[PDB]
C-alpha cells in the first residue's frame, strides 16, 4: 500500500491547530505525508511541534482584511467575541488561496472542521474528505444534527436547548437548567451563516465524520452521529501528546515530599480560563476549609496585581505551609504523578479529563463550558470515576460545595469516595493498557484507507 497524503485545514484557532498537528505527527509517524494550512503566526507559535519535517509540511494561509477584522488578526486568541463575525467570514474568503493550494498538493484526503466549502472543493480537485472534530462527542451529539429543528428567524429556548434532540443515546449526558445557556452559541450567527448551518453542511458534506475520542468513552454517542448523518464515525483515539519528560521543579518535589502519599490536593483549570476574583476567592477558601494539603495552580483574577493581592485577607497567614496558590505554570503530568497528589480538582477540560482518567488520584470536577459540563456528566453520572461540584445559575460555585466535594473523595470514611476509586481503577486500566492508544490510530488509518 503506497502511503497517503493528507492535508488539514482547520479552524483558525491554536485550540484547532494544535490537535490537528498532534494527529499529523502521529500520521507522519505511520510513514504518511501531512501538509497543513494555517496562518503565519500560527505557525510562529506551533511551528516547533512538528516532529517529522520531512513528512509533514506547513503552507502559511494569508487571512484577508475584511470589514470590521482587527488588523493583522489571524487566529481566536486574536481577537475577542466582538471580532468573532469577521474572523470567520475571513475565515472563508481563503477559500480561493486554498483551492490553489489544493489543486498543486492534490492530496487524496483533506481534514477540516469548519471550512463547510471544503466539500465544493473536493468536487472540483477531486479528494476524499473528513470532516474532524476536536470537541467531544456528547457535545455534537446534544447539539447540531438533523433531528433538531434549529429555527432560521428566532432564537432557541433554554427549554428547547435543555431538551436534547430525540433518538439521543443518554438522559444521563444531558444539561440541566441554566446549565442550558452553555449551548445557545449553536444558534448564533458565525461569520455570515449561523453556526448550525455551517455544521450542518459541513457534516453533511464530507465522505467522514472523525472524532478524537474512543468508543468505550462515547461510543452510542458516535453512533448516533452516525445515523443521524448517515455517515460513517472514524475514532481517532484521544491522541494525547507525549508527556513533557524532564524532573518535577524541585521546589514542588520538596514541598510535595514533606506530606504524606494521596493527601494533597491538586487544582488546575485549564490554560484557558481566568476566574473572575468573587470566584476565585470563593475557591481559594473553600480549600482551606478542607484542611487537607493542597497545591492551587491558577492564574490570576485579571486586574490582580498579584496573587497574593487577589487572596482574601488573612488567608495567607491562616493556611501557612498547608497550601499553595501558585500564579505560575506547572508541569501538570509530574505533579500528578507526585506520590503525594491524591486528588485532582479540575474544570473537565479535555486535557485534565484524560489526564485525570489516567492517573491514580481522585476526581472533582468544575465545568465552566458546555462541553465541560457534558464531559462532567459522563465522569460523574454514567461513569461514576469522578464527583462534580455542585454549581449555580452562572456556574457560581460555593466554598461549602467545593470543600464538600474535595471531603468526599478524600475522607476515607466516604463511601462515595470508595465507589470513585473504584470505577476510577477499571476505567484507567482499560485507558493504559498496552498498545490501547495505538490501535485506535492503526484502526483509524485503516479506515481512511477504505
Ligand atoms: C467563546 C466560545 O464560543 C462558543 O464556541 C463556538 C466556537 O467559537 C470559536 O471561537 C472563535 C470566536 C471567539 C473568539 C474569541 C472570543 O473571546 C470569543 O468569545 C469567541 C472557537 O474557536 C470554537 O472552538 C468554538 O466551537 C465550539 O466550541 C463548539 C463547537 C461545536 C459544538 C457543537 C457541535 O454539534 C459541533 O459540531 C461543534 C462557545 O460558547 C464556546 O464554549 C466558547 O468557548
Ligand atoms: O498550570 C497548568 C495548566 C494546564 N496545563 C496543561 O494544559 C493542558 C490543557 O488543559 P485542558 O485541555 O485541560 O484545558 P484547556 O486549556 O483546553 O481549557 C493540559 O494538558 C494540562 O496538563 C499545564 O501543564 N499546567
Request: hydrophobic share 40%.
Amino acid at each position: 500500500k503506497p502511503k497517503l497524503h493528507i492535508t488539514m485545514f482547520p479552524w483558525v484557532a491554536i485550540g484547532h491547530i494544535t490537535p490537528f498537528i498532534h494527529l499529523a505527527n502521529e500520521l507522519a509517524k505511520r510513514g504518511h505525508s501531512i501538509s497543513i494550512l494555517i496562518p503565519k503566526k500560527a505557525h510562529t507559535q506551533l511551528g516547533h511541534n512538528n516532529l517529522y519535517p520531512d513528512l509533514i509540511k506547513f503552507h502559511i494561509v494569508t487571512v484577508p482584511h475584511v470589514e470590521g477584522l482587527p488588523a493583522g488578526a489571524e487566529t481566536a486568541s486574536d481577537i475577542d467575541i466582538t471580532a468573532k463575525n469577521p474572523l470567520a467570514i475571513a475565515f472563508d474568503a481563503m477559500y480561493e488561496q486554498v483551492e490553489t493550494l489544493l489543486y498543486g498538493l492534490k492530496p487524496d484526503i483533506v481534514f477540516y472542521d469548519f471550512a463547510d466549502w471544503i466539500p465544493k472543493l473536493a468536487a472540483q480537485i477531486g479528494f476524499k474528505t473528513v470532516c474532524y472534530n476536536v470537541i467531544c462527542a456528547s457535545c455534537m451529539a446534544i447539539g447540531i444534527v438533523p433531528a433538531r429543528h434549529i429555527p432560521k428567524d428566532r432564537p432557541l429556548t433554554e427549554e428547547e436547548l435543555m431538551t436534547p434532540p430525540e433518538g439521543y443515546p443518554s438522559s444521563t449526558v444531558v444539561l440541566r437548567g441554566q446549565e442550558a445557556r452553555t449551548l445557545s452559541f449553536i444558534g448564533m450567527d458565525y461569520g455570515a451563516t449561523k453556526f448550525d448551518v455551517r455544521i450542518t453542511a459541513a457534516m453533511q458534506g464530507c465522505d467522514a465524520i472523525g472524532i478524537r475520542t474512543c468508543r468505550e468513552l462515547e461510543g452510542p454517542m458516535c453512533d448516533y452521529l452516525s445515523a443521524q448523518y448517515n455517515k460513517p464515525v472514524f475514532l481517532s483515539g484521544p491522541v494525547l501528546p507525549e508527556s513533557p519528560k524532564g524532573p518535577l521543579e524541585e521546589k514542588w518535589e520538596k514541598w510535595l515530599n514533606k506530606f504524606e502519599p494521596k493527601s494533597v490536593v491538586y487544582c488546575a483549570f485549564g490554560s484557558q480560563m481566568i476566574l473572575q476574583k468573587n470566584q476565585f476567592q470563593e475557591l481559594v477558601l473553600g480549600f482551606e476549609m478542607t484542611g487537607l494539603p493542597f497545591f492551587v495552580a491558577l492564574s490570576k483574577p485579571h486586574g490582580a496585581d498579584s496573587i497574593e493581592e487577589a487572596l482574601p485577607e488573612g488567608f495567607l497567614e491562616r493556611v501557612g505551609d498547608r497550601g499553595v496558590v501558585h500564579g505560575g505554570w506547572v508541569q501538570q503530568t509530574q505533579i500528578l504523578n507526585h506520590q503525594s497528589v491524591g486528588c485532582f480538582v479540575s474544570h473537565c477540560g479535555f486535557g485534565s479529563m484524560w489526564e485525570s482518567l489516567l492517573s491514580d488520584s481522585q476526581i472533582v470536577l468544575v465545568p465552566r463550558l458546555a462541553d465541560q459540563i457534558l464531559n462532567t456528566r459522563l465522569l460523574a453520572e454514567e461513569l461514576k470515576v469522578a464527583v462534580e461540584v455542585e454549581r449555580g445559575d452562572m456556574g457560581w460555585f460555593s466554598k461549602e460545595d467545593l470543600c464538600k466535594a474535595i471531603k468526599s473523595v478524600m475522607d476515607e470514611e466516604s463511601e462515595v469516595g470508595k465507589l470513585v476509586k473504584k470505577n476510577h481503577a477499571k476505567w484507567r486500566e482499560t485507558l493504559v493498557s498496552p498498545g490501547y492508544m495505538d490501535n485506535y490510530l492503526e484502526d483509524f488509518i485503516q479506515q481512511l484507507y477504505g
